[model samples]
Target: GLTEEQRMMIRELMDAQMKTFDTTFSHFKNFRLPGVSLKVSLQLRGEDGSVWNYKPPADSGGKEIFSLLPHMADMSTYMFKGIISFAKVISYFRDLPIEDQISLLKGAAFELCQLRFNTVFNAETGTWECGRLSYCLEDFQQLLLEPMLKFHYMLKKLQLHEEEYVLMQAISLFSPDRPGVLQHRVVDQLQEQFAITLKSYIECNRPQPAHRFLFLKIMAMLTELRSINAQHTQRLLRIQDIHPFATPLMQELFGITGS
Candidate 1:
């Protein structure tokens, strides 16, 4: 009973996921953990109510479908730990002076790399090893961490200027969609919760005088990220343009506006 289009979409998604996993695992085998092999499995619950399973080659050494559940849970835990640590680092940097902030940031980056290496090693050696999955997970973790890491690094090295500061403020106001601001409705709830305007709150909490330069540096990175996101969004819209049938769905998916 599955529509041809829906079936095709599902196939495309699964194929892309597998391809990404394959490349990730291959990278892991070549660099991080040389002896490990990786693989991924996809299951499609069809409109006909039948479940179809797609397993990568056995040589890839991925786990059985049922076994992946527990590993997925572990992956989630590690992912959360990485995210929380990142948030703490960001908050800490936001409160420091540029010089001391940079030093702290450098230490944080080194620590993050160590954490990543350790996590990858443990996952590779675990009882339920899937080199490819571990690699993919690690790669995803890196993607999440790298932006903040690079921003911190740039803040340490970049020269401060007014244009740079304004750009940074703009970015902090919107980019990477800070969860605290986005979730707590900081824009709307600013006075009620913080007893101050958003602008004033930022000014008061701004990183210390020594690290004040970091404010502009972070903003510049954020502006760059925003540009990237915007370009990506446009590309996706262009894809929908070529396939008129997808227009409505695309519009619905991306229609939300933030204040």
Candidate 2:
């Protein structure tokens, strides 16, 4: 139930947001390592960062995130850049009630980061492809690597288009129905407008089972993200429990709490 003007508005916003994601990733596409910024001073941060060096390179073989711990501070820069891009991309939402904005971002940003993580994923080898090293799936501390590997495995199958992925990010942010939303009706309407906009584009652009299949695929992929984030967050929280320098941004991103 939208006017042509309304539809146009939604379409433009969707295009703008999608471009932000594409452009952000594009900025880092050739960036040596898409997520971590390397510097001479930063080479030896992780505990015994040397663990990764060796003729055969220690194959202690398990998802040990600590090995890359040194990279956390810099990796945060990469992740933070992504979150900032979405904030700009969805600047449209800044006008929402403060409570609604808070609720929505808390729920959405974690999911968004996962997609960013996948942007550099190498499903073929089950590792993060964007870093100087392969960033082995086994390298992640036991907390998230296992589940994340499984998540990436499923991700390779979806093959979502850039636009569809972007739409999903917007949908997630505008989920007025999420647990903490304050402007339920307003957020709900905004979320609906986004879904409609996506459907309209897909209906005209692709044909056959693919058009229908893509829509289903988007829905299917989403079904897994919450559970995926939930699993990953718990592990991250555990890390926070033990480490003196726990990551606040990640805590905010995952909305970690007893809940």
Candidate 3:
């Protein structure tokens, strides 16, 4: 139910912006540096597929990652790489009010990361085993990770197809409701348009009846994303206050600031 121009913009977003982001999404994988590289490098994937990168563990593994006394710059590298990569993918993102773009990226990135994490998550154990590590998903569960993995669980538990993952990510990022967004209603309408398009998408592509439930289920996940992001920020603040570590990029991503 959009005007011709509105429909064209939606098509442009789908054909241009989302497609561009999908390229980045496809390249996402676990990574790390090897024991020895000719030149110093922050990351490398081992021949056996082990990932060795700058990881800041709240546990003992955190210090071992620093055995060689890695700089804060090293710790900052991968996280910033991730944050910047998200911005780099959207062709129209720079044209937005730069502040609005930052706000959207800040508000949305964590949940979006979690959703994509589900693309590789091992639900049976609830531990995302990438390489030699199997992290406890529970720590971040109530804080930020549960809703996303549980949403993915529902999909897997119900045997939903692959296409839903692609559409869910597209709809998640196209939102207008990010804090400091100037055109909240406008983006809401855009996200609504994206949903209607996805609705018909399932109609033609997926088997009848149950496949149409995507909108409601995924819409609820979108709603919870805001809630989870807020909790994650709060949790970061609480932890930083007690521990006082040097992780500027993590703080920046979750909107943490101050002493």
Candidate 4:
């Protein structure tokens, strides 16, 4: 049985982490479908239809594709800052070796972003409905969009609460085996603790034998996230080779060397 102390612990962590999570995603939480301009509506009926004209021409080169999504860099940079702030508030995160901390962020940053993005994803429409912009799977070229959406649909189907989302971010962040980690055992224990909290919360809150497998399904989504991360790295490298436009922070997270 999860004791009263354990429940309180989870509640406190949720309170603290969500303080940062909401700063980045409050827009998503309050999002409404924006009015489509007449020009855009007419265009949507024709070919130049993607939101923000985000889709690239089949023959468009890297620079062209990169330029098309001018909002991408600012949005990504903001999310990167959000990831750092979320980790900074965790007591154990402050104690990790510096290199281990960097390694963990390097490995898990995109996964965390994916989880946060899922909060606003419209699975029925297959669109990520951020307040200012809506993104569909086809807008991305090299990234693993189809497989990524499959995982998102499963998680969305679960209808996870805010607490579970924060817990998963911590669980993904404390992965011990990420390349360049120096204190694997310590990170391992931290990850285990978070995982236990997650499992216990689900069991206590769901409280039905019918919901018995939710924790396992959540864990399996993490496995799929790992695969998506690997593929994302490969695609980022390919994009880097062409445009060489990754910002300094992105370079550090993805370990992309300067051209």
Ranking by TM-score: 4, 2, 3, 1
Candidate 1, position 206, lDDT: 53
State, as a TM-score between 0 and 1, how close model 2 is to the true structure: 0.68
Model 3 lDDT per residue over 48-131, tens place: 888655433333534343332234233233434554565555544555676767777766666666655565555676554433
lDDT ranking from best candidate downward? 4, 2, 3, 1
The models' CA-based lDDT, in order, is 0.34, 0.59, 0.54, 0.72
Query: What stretches of model 4 exceed 4 Å from their correct place?
Result: 22-63, 137-145
Candidate 2 residue-wise lDDT, 1-259, digit = tens: 5468556655656666555543323344222221231111112122346533211124355433344443554465456556656655555587787777767766776777677677667676555554433454332234234555566666666665666666777776677766788788888888787777777667766767745667666656666786776666676677667653335565555564534
How big is the RMSD of model 4? 6.6
**Which 10 consecutive residues of model 2 have the lowest summed lDDT?**
37-46
- Return the TM-score for each candidate structure: 0.25, 0.68, 0.63, 0.79
Candidate achieving higher TM-score, 3 or 4: 4
RMSD of each: 20.1, 7.4, 7.4, 6.6
